[PDB]
Amino acid sequence: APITAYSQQTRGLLGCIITSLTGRDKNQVDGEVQVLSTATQSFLATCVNGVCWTVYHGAGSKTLAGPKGPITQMYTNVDQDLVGWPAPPGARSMTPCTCGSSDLYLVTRHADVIPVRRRGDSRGSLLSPRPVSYLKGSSGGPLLCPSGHVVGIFRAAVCTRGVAKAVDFIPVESMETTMRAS
């Protein structure tokens, strides 16, 4: 894989409960991908054209804790499992992929970069099988073309007896379809 990644934590379990309740986060923001938490689960958000995109089944209808207080969702599509908030200052906006390269790369919450073979518009095969538990918490994470552009975000895993052989994702196209119906 050409692409690499590392993570940096910003908050602990306590300051997260606090920030959750005040909706106000002073921490400086960086990175293409944000690691997000509610009370009951963790997941990922990918910034693309100034919107922080993630899944509904992680974020629900919630606000994002921000510097000027809670940020209201700018896009909400329950049935796509997609939501987006305006990207906080300093998040690194990613660029959409359109060249349609066949081999993709999933970035997990562990900052691992996993080879995927595109099988269709919103489906991708894992060249190498992984535990479901290993992917759990990476919904919202980006699938990248080899150039580092974003093709989609991770939505669900195709799996059997706790082993995942494929990923279902929201193609960067659907993020247009929600924006138009705004």
Next chain:
Amino acid sequence: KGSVVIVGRIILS
């Protein structure tokens, strides 16, 4: 009622 919180980030190269 609780807002979602950024607890970390991932840097890409």
